[PDB]
Amino acid sequence: ATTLYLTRHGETKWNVERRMQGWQDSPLTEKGRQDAMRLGKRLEAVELAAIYTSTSGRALETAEIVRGGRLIPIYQDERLREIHLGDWEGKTHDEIRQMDPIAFDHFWQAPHLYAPQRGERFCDVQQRALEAVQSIVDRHEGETVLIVTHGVVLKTLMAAFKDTPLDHLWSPPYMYGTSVTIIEVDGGTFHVAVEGDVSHIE
Questions:
Q1: What's a single GO MF annotation on this record (predicted)?
Q2: Which of 9, 138, 153, 197 is most buried per CB count within 10 Å?
């Protein structure tokens, strides 16, 4: 019996610059900080036992803003990093379409067909993120915790919980930054209680 609050960091410079991030990082934008503040307010009542995020700076910032001085430990897990995009990182979409037009199309249109030479495949992400989630519920029996991660990780996770095949990874709902998704873990099973709720952000 564990309650998992899930979300992804807000807007970053590269986000608005439409540059792909992955393992490279970039600071939050003013808007990204406001979104986190607002999410931090919505969770002021939830009795969080802890917070897990990736080792990425943009995720850590969001977590610190959300914790806002509350006595809560923040743990960083590599298994929650965004998909490693290899050669695509730090490059814009237009720039990428110039290099690997097909792979780029598969990425968004046929995820299950995405097979980069050095980057990470979607199932690689889903698998390690699942481990993280499992180790997290293992360490928090009878507790509620928050997980701040990234777009893709969040999506592969939702897919595992919804039992959706990876080819339908990008299916709705869209997962906004700092959106709230709640997963209830009873008897070892994952129940999607709330998905992508974006009130507070409005």
A1: phosphatase activity
A2: 9
Which candidate, 158, 154, 157, places its Cα nearest to that of 176? 154
- Enter the resolution in angstroms: 2.3
Q: What is the DSSP string of 153-181?
A: HHHHHHHHHHT--GGGTTPSSP--TT-EE
Q: Is 15 annotated as a binding residue?
A: yes
Check whether 170 is labelled as a binding-site residue. Answer: no
Rounded to whole angstroms, how far apart are CA atoms 86 and 156?
19
Out of 82, 89, 140, 150, which one is annotated catalytic? 82
Q: Token pair for residue 158? A: 């939702």
Tell me the technique behind this structure. X-ray
82 is catalytic: yes
**Domain range annotation of the chain:** 1-202
Q: Annotated catalytic, 93?
A: no
| Superfamily of domain 1-202 in the CATH hierarchy | Phosphoglycerate mutase-like (3.40.50.1240)
What distance, in Å, lies between the first and last C-alpha atoms of the chain?
A: 31
Residue 9 among known ligand-binding residues:
yes
**Is residue 187 a known part of a binding site?**
no
Report helix, strand and coil shares of the chain as percent, to nearest 5.
40, 20, 40
